Ligand binder design. Structure first.
Ligand SMILES: COc1ccccc1CC(=O)N1CCO[C@@H](C(N)=O)C1
Ligand SMILES: [Zn+2]
Length: 140
């Protein structure tokens, strides 16, 4: 589990969104596994606006943050899971690292701020849903 709290937005994996998230919906995209809902309180996270390919992510199944090198956001075939059939997920970045299903939501960050959240995994890989192109998270 896990979310990004920036401004009056909450960014979560679409497959982990709650009824309150759907009832206060700002934007959602199944092909990216992302959903954004509105919040009453202002958050403290800031979004990275860069093309870094190195950063650090939180892994809840190890209670640890790991440094990683990750690929640029792209269209990748992801195997079937409990939440989606096997399909192409867009804006996904891959790294070598530990991830279990419940690790979804962990933040990936670089020197500039939050880059994305854990979305996929398996066999020593971890995939992150990028948020650096969502410029509207910084305003309104
Ligand atoms: C954290 O992912 C792991 C890790 C190890 C093994 C399996 C998973 C589960 C997984 O790949 N999912 C969860 C549901 O959403 C899927 C998606 N975003 O397409 C991806
Ligand atoms: Zn950066």
């Amino acid at each position: 589990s896990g979310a990004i709290y920036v401004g009056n937005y909450r960014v979560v994996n679409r497959h982990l969104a709650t009824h309150n998230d759907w009832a206060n919906l700002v934007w959602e995209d199944s092909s990216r596994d992302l959903l954004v809902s509105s919040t009453t309180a202002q958050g403290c996270d800031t979004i990275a606006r860069c093309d870094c390919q190195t950063g650090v992510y939180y892994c809840s199944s190890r209670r640890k943050h790991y440094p990683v090198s990750f690929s640029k956001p792209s269209l990748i075939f992801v195997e079937a899971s409990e939440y989606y059939p096997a399909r192409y997920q867009s804006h996904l970045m891959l790294a070598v690292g530990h991830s279990e299903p419940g690790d979804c939501g962990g933040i990936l960050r670089c020197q500039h701020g939050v880059v994305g959240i854990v979305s996929t995994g398996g066999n020593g890989l971890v995939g992150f849903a990028d948020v650096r192109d969502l410029l509207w998270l910084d305003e309104e």
